[PDB]
Each structure stands twice: as C-alpha cells, then as structure tokens.
Design a protein around this ligand. Structure first.
Ligand SMILES: NC(=O)c1ccc[n+]([C@@H]2O[C@H](COP(=O)([O-])OP(=O)(O)OC[C@H]3O[C@@H](n4cnc5c(N)ncnc54)[C@H](O)[C@@H]3O)[C@@H](O)[C@H]2O)c1
Ligand SMILES: NC(=O)c1ccc[n+]([C@@H]2O[C@H](COP(=O)([O-])OP(=O)(O)OC[C@H]3O[C@@H](n4cnc5c(N)ncnc54)[C@H](O)[C@@H]3O)[C@@H](O)[C@H]2O)c1
Ligand SMILES: [Mg+2]
Ligand SMILES: [Mg+2]
Ligand SMILES: [Zn+2]
Ligand SMILES: [Zn+2]
Ligand SMILES: [Zn+2]
Ligand SMILES: [Zn+2]
Lengths: 408, 414
C-alpha cells in the first residue's frame, strides 16, 4: 500500500539572497511500498547535519530538485521488499551513505568504508530512474520527488535499500531516538574520524578544527582513547566551552588570534618543540581550516582527516604547497570511516557507556524524563515553526537541532 | 683539490646570483666561479664530489624555488662523493667513504622515526635557512671588488661544486654495500631514483597484482616504473606529453601509456586512467612525479576511493604557493601524501634500496635513465664543471631536449 505522510520538500536550491520560505515547505507526500531488498521505515526523528543545510543551498544536487531533505535520522521498519534478508518489521535502523559488501577490494583492504558496490547514491533516485516519493501539485498533477542520496530522513516514512541499513534494537534496545539519529551521521563521523581514520592511541595529541556536533563527537572519542592533549579551534565560545567540559585540554578562538598568527601556528605553539599534533581533524566546512588542519599535523607521521563540507568555488579546495609536500597527509572521510557491519556495532556498544552517553546528552541537550532536546521542532506543527527552527540552527548554543517526525 | 695551510680548499662551483624569474636567461644568473670551501666543523663531512645530476627541483631552485632571500648560492641537492675530511666530533664515517646526503636525516629516537612509517625526522629536518645553524656558510667567494662574500647552500649543502660540506647526520655510505657502483648511479640514488622507487615501494606500498598510475615519466617517474615492475604490479599506466619518455617507460615495464595532450575531447587524464581499470574503479596506487599542479588533482582522482594512496613527489612554482583538489572526489575517498626522497630513510631503508640497485634488471633500468656507457663512464647528457660556463648554459637549455632524462654534471675525475 501507498502511505500518505508529511515530509519536508525543497522546491529548488536556496541560493545566496534567498530565504528558507522561498524553497522549504512541509507537504503531504505519497510513499510507495518497498520493492526488492528495500525497507520502508517509520521515522522517529531526523537531526540536522550542517550538510542538510548545504543540501537546502543546492550542495551535490545540481538537478535533483524538488527533493525531500535529510540523511541523518532513525526509524522503525514498517515493511520490506520480498528479497530482503537480515531485517525484521519492528527493527530500529539507521542507513548512512555507504554500505559494506565485504567482498570488493576496498572492503577486503580492512582500512576503508568506501565500498565499490554500495557507494553513495548521487542520482538521488532508484536505479531505474524512478522514486518511491511523489506528491500532488496545486495543479493536481503527480510529480516525482528526489531523495537526498539513497533515501530522505525529513519524512514520516522513508524507503532505503537494506544494503545501507544497520540495526540498533538488539545491542541498544533502550537508545533514545535523537541519540540513534546522531549515530547515523554526526556522532559516527566525529567519533570514527578519531577512532578509526586518525587511529588515535593513548598518549597522542589531537587538534579538532570546528566543534559543532561532529567536532564535539571527536572530542568525546579523543578523551575515551586517552589522548594526552585535545586542542579545539572554533569562532564559537559556547561550543569551545562545551568541548572543554567534555574532555578538550586547550581551546583557541580563531577569530581572536592576532592577524599574523594562523590557526595552525597557534596549534603548533601548544605542542613541544612546535612539532604539531599526532592527529588533526577538520570538522568545520571552512576551506581555510582544511589547509590549517593539514599544517598542524606532525610532518609525515600524523594524518589529517577532512570531514568538512561546503559549497566551494569550482568545487575546489586548496593546500599551501610547500607545507603539503614536506609531510602533509590528508584523507577525505565520510561517516567517520565507520563501516555499517564491521565497525558500527562496536560504536553502538561504546555509545551506551555512561561518559559517552553523557557526551551525547550534552550535544543534544537531551532531557531523559521528557525525551526533548534543547533545539527541537516537530514536523506535525507546521511550516512556520520549521522555518524558524532552520534559522535557529545558527544560534550560538544550537549544537544539534532535532526534527521529531512521529510519537516515540 | 688540496687545502691551503688554513685547511681552505679553492675549487669550482656553480653560483646562482639571484632568482631566474620568467623571461630571464641562464646567462643572467648562472656562473661557474672559484669558491673557498672552509674546513668541516663539529660532525660535518667535507666531500670531494664525483658528479651531481640535475633534478627538476635544481632548475626550480635556479628560478627561486624555496629561496626568497637565499641568493647568491651554490646550487644542487642530487650528487655523490668521497669524504675528504671530517669535523672532530664525527662518528661512523671514515675519510674515503663514498656518501650521498639527501634532505632528511634519521635520528631513530623521535616519535616520527619510531613510528616506522615516515622519513620526516623531527631532529634532522630540511635545512630551509640554506645556512649553518650559527648563520655562517662553509662557502665564500672573492668578488670583483676583492671582498669576501657568503654563498648560501641549497638546503643543508650544495652538490654543484667540486667540494661540499654537510652535517654527517644527513649522510649514508655506498662503498661497503656497493663498492663498484658508478658515480652517476650513486648521484640519482641521492634523489631522483630513491624518490620514484620509494614512492612505489614504501609510500604507496605497491603489492604484487596491484594497478599503478604514474603521472610524469621524467627520471622520478621512470624510477617508479622500475619499482612497480620489480614489485610485479599487474598494470602500470604512465601519463605524460613527452612521447620519448613514455616509450622509455614502456621499455622498462609500463603496461599502458597515455599522452595527456592527445586525449579525446572531454576525457581528463583521471578518466583516461580509470577507463583502463575494471568497472572504471581506478588504480591501487597513484604516483604524481610531474610538477604539474593539474596532474596532482588528476592523480588523486585516478586512485581507488579510500583504499589507494596518491603519493605527490612533484614540485613547482604555483600561483600563491598553493595546489588544488576537486572537493567531491577528495571527500569521497581522496588520500594524498607529500613525499620527499621516496620516504627512503637513510639508515633503515637506503641500504636495501642500494642492494636492490645492484640487481641486474634494476641496474639496466638506471643505465637506461642515465644512458650510461660503462666503457667511457659517460652519460648521454653530461657536462663537466671544469669546461666553462658556456658549456653549462647550453646543457641547462638542453635539459628540455625530449631525450634528456637525466643530465649529469661531472665534478672530478672518477
Ligand atoms: N564527511 C561526513 O560524513 C560529514 C558528516 C557530518 C557533517 N559533515 C560536515 O562536517 C562539518 C561539521 O558538521 P556539523 O554538523 O558539526 O557542522 P556545524 O556547522 O554544526 O559546526 C561547524 C563548526 O565549525 C565552526 N566553524 C565554521 N566556520 C568557521 C570559521 N570560519 N571560523 C571558525 N570556526 C568555524 C562553527 O563555528 C561550528 O562550531 C560541516 O561542514 C558538515 O557539512 C560531513
Ligand atoms: N619530492 C621529492 O623528493 C622530489 C624529488 C625529485 C624531484 N621532485 C619533483 O618531482 C617532479 C619530477 O622530477 P623529475 O626530475 O623527474 O622532473 P622532469 O621535469 O625531468 O620530469 C617531469 C615529467 O612530467 C612531465 N610533465 C610536466 N608537466 C607536464 C604537463 N603539463 N603535461 C604533461 N606532462 C607533463 C614532463 O614531460 C616530464 O616527463 C618535479 O616536479 C621535481 O621538481 C621532487
Ligand atoms: Mg531501491
Ligand atoms: Mg653544520
Ligand atoms: Zn551528515
Ligand atoms: Zn565493498
Ligand atoms: Zn631532487
Ligand atoms: Zn628522528
């Protein structure tokens, strides 16, 4: 059967000068039943990744409008296509951008999550060029809606290929929805960038450039892995203070440095003999911080892990060439290199330990008694409340906005 | 080649007066002169140079690369020679040892050395000052006013001179492992050959059955081909615009060649490389050895997402001293490292490279790079520092000859 539900439609890219009102609306959509190995999923909540706002601005979607937004969220399996294996109706799942076939040479390497068989669905469509999402326009015509990539989370019901899904309910039966939501992107990204990609060991020094939800997740990982030194860099004093409270040892307000002192110079001055850090994480989306993160790393030895995204002129980023040749080591990172079968189960177990749960609670501003987050909007309460919430994503103390989609 | 009563040697060296900026000539800045080489101090080696050989970075140095204030200088970082004398604190070297001394030493005690996975030593890093730590230089000359003037190094030393002084922490010896290795082979082991060979062997960690792409088959890239063939790569794809050097790469084990200037409309070099791989997945290892900023991005893009490493060896004078990467490709599995001297650590890795260099197939490859004639000990492109500046200027222009892979500068009798 076809489900009618609420979803957040993006009519067109919000280009500079345009408002959220110009492009973002809560509408009724039609969600087709799942086919093949798909899950149709009753969404509990989505949470707002900075990449969700980039999507609203047209990021990676030159033609793929109108769409339903969102890649960060959690929900419950309502129904499955006839070929689906290893899932049941009622399982709680997240479905990030990359699957894990376990047989391709990338999977078999043991050192990456960039699966050759279950890669990013850049088409924002089913492989036959159709979509499980449609709506009736004010002209009465049935119109296609694009996904974000393989799915959209800013909807009461989504459909996703089960080769991208991983279940929460067996390991973490009591995990609240907003915590499941941040495990699907922001928290897996920051935690994994430190744990898996930079491979932080006890006694290592770490620099994190940008302490939004991703960078704070990285601080939580660095503290858990017993980093000797955790340096955070941002312009936002509220989030720097939150980073310090959750384990960071030194903070730098990049907008308060002297004009002649770069962020990388300030970071290196905190390290013995100005040698730099064992691990350098960028989690800002500021193209300048991608270059500064590369420079703050110990030449050759240290890895710089780039998680940041933004809308860059010619879709290009830059590095200072001499500092790059003489020991730069830079990797692109998607979802913290957290492989959905090999790594995610272990991350889920770790997320339930009390200090890690306390860190996720602080990111979210979660109240256990009411199951409310500090910044939360409900899709059932109208487009104006949503437009205000999306503006308030820029509020100094908004770390993670949660979009409630159904009763918990 | 004999010191005066104060231990000072007078010899020939190639002086760079100032940066050769765009539109300037070799004649504007390059001159063979008589210099005074002071005796070695502390742990220094004073080295009778046999030959230097011309790395593209030597030409970038003529053009002002990494030397905003460090003129006049003696050029050169690629060469080999014999210890003539040592500072009083020197350990583990003897007068008569044959040495090379690249940009990075190996202290074996810093956290970078102890990692086992890099040559960027914290204690013996690149000497960017082009001077002694006290602001002096072992090199001077008497100018036309009769005044004694300082000459900068390249970095920790200069090779375009009959006599060089270098901190012994940067040196590694050839004569115990490879007593019969000829000078020009020793010279390319000091930079070009270590860089291309080590980029493949150590940094990209190429395995039997791996696919490899090499962007730029000058001496460094052809050294990478030799390593990739030795390591039994399944596929070795070379990219360049120089037909002569692409053909040489094919003769030394490349499987596929791509002329970047002859690509069909709307096919990038990364797309051309990917089209030669199963399901257009790209290569297990991507080596950039061109100095072309475009190829640094194309190399990144040709790599299998996440799994493969892109090793950047290239150097150049870039707008705003920066290079660029396509962000979407970079985020979704880009993996790029800067490489100096092939990550070949002078104590831990250089000895095995040197043993490898004496194996018949590897020696044949070095001979082809050099166009070496064992009968005459002459290379195809060779100029002698004792034969005057005009011959040197002609040789520098001829670096651009399509069949010049490695110009050698003879410095002394062998
Ligand atoms: N690679 C992935 O899988 C992945 C996953 C999550 C998010 N992202 C990207 O990673 C980044 C972090 O995600 P997020 O949701 O935490 O983002 P966010 O926007 O909530 O947080 C970014 C932080 O960086 C700081 N920052 C940004 N520009 C700055 C500047 N000019 N000077 C100083 N500080 C600056 C901000 O003040 C903020 O605290 C974003 O670019 C996002 O698009 C990617
Ligand atoms: N990282 C290190 O330790 C190290 C050591 C050696 C040299 N280098 C640098 O590595 C690079 C290779 O050194 P080399 O001595 O072999 O240089 P080279 O100039 O002899 O060879 C470079 C090759 O790349 C090709 N190339 C350059 N620009 C091109 C373009 N626009 N289109 C197509 N092909 C192009 C050339 O045709 C040539 O065959 C140079 O940039 C050099 O400065 C660095
Ligand atoms: Mg499908
Ligand atoms: Mg000295
Ligand atoms: Zn995200
Ligand atoms: Zn796979
Ligand atoms: Zn060189
Ligand atoms: Zn060291």
């Amino acid at each position: 059967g076809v489900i009618t539900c609420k979803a957040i439609m993006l009519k067109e890219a919000k280009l500079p000068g345009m408002s959220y009102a110009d492009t973002v609306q809560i509408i009724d959509i039609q969600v087709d039943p799942p086919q093949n190995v798909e899950l149709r999923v009753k969404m509990l909540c989505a949470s707002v990744c900075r990449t969700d706002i980039l999507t609203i601005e047209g990021f990676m979607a030159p033609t793929q409008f109108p769409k339903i937004n969102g890649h960060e969220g959690v929900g419950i399996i309502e129904s499955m296509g006839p070929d689906t294996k290893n899932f049941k109706v009622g399982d709680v799942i997240v479905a990030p951008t990359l699957g894990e076939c376990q047989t391709c040479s990338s999977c078999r390497s043991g050192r990456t999550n960039f699966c050759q068989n279950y890669g990013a669905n850049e088409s924002a469509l089913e492989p036959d060029g159709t979509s499980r999402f449609s709506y009736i326009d004010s002209d009465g015509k049935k119109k296609l809606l694009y996904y974000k990539l393989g799915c959209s989370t800013w909807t009461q019901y989504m459909v996703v290929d089960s080769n991208y899904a991983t279940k929460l309910n067996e390991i973490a039966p009591e995990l609240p929805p907003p915590h499941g939501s941040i495990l699907s992107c922001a928290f897996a990204t920051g935690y994994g960038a430190v744990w898996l990609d930079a491979a932080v060991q006890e006694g290592d020094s770490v620099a994190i450039f940008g302490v939004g939800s991703v960078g704070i997740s990285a601080v939580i990982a660095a503290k858990e892995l017993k980093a000797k030194q955790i340096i955070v860099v941002d312009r936002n004093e509220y989030k720097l203070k939150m980073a310090m409270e959750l384990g960071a040892t030194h903070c730098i307000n990049s907008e308060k440095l002297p004009e002649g002192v770069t962020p990388s110079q300030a970071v290196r001055k905190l390290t013995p003999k100005e040698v730099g850090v064992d691990a350098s994480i960028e989690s800002s989306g500021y193209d300048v911080f991608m270059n500064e993160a590369m420079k703050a790393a110990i030449h050759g030895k240290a890895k710089t892990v780039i998680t940041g995204e933004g809308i860059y002129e010619n879709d290009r980023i830059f590095f200072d060439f001499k500092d790059f040749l003489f020991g730069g080591n830079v990797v692109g990172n998607v979802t913290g290199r957290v492989r959905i079968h090999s790594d995610f189960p272990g991350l889920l177990r770790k997320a339930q330990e009390p200090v890690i749960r306390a860190g996720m609670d602080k990111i979210l501003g979660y109240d256990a008694a009411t199951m409310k987050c500090k910044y939360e909007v409900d899709i059932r309460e109208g487009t104006p409340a949503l437009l205000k919430a999306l503006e308030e994503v820029e509020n100094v103390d908004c770390v993670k906005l949660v979009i409630k989609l159904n009763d918990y």
